[PDB]
Amino acid sequence: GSHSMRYFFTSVSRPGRGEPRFIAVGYVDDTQFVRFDSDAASQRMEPRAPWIEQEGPEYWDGETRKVKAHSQTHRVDLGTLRGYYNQSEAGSHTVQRMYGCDVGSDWRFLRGYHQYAYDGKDYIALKEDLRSWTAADMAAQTTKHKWEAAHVAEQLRAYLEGTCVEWLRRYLENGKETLQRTDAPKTHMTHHAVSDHEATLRCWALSFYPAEITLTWQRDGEDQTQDTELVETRPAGDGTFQKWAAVVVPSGQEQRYTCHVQHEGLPKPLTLRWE
């Protein structure tokens, strides 16, 4: 079972109406485990999954201290970048940072990430070699030169290849039952008459974990890719996901069609047919 840990940080300037907004969430695979929000009363790092709730005060106090240090850097980053781009102190701007690590089926390091974005565009990113930076432009290049001097990538290579992977594996066995589990999709089809000579076949995939899935329709064994409506995998709100795929069938042809479901929780891929 391959896995990942990721930290997502969002800061938004509120020119004129206070200090900037800073949201930090952490995820192991598709399960969120902590959060910190600047506009919250506690001003603490908070558990968001039960398996993390039992960590001691040392864990919570240390991550609160670190996420609050993260928060200051990102507010300073809003002014800095506004300077780089000679912007007005009136408009709201966004900086987003993501870092984490991917491990294999063997739970050994597979790759690590460190990406920064200003106003929804890539700014600077650590490359896969965890040694060089991808500076988008001149501002990004001013930052890269600061990060090169600060021996920043080298510091990050150690975190992602070490610490990240180490705590990822600790979270994995500490939340064994939760994020080392798989929920297979509960599947089913609906059929409704859109009119006298045509109808919709909707194929459903519900209560699955993790969020990946391939839900496909085929007619006479052929792919109906451009003729299928496929929604984006939604969250159900209880830690599992949902998805559907639909085709408008000419009446009399329901039997030509098959829904195909692929998910890690399924011993064998599913092929459903309305009949």
């Binding site: 930290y7 952490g26 864990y59 240390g62 991550e63 670190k66 996420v67 240090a69 993260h70 850097t73 300073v76 980053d77 800095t80 970048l81 900086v95 870092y99 920064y116 700014y123 600077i124 930052t143 600061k146 990060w147 600060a150 920043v152 510091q155 990050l156 975190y159 610490t163 990240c164 705590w167």
Partner: peptide
């Protein structure tokens, strides 16, 4: 756990 320290752009 979070990375520390964090450097400014």
């Amino acid at each position: 756990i979070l990375k520390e320290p964090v450097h400014g752009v």
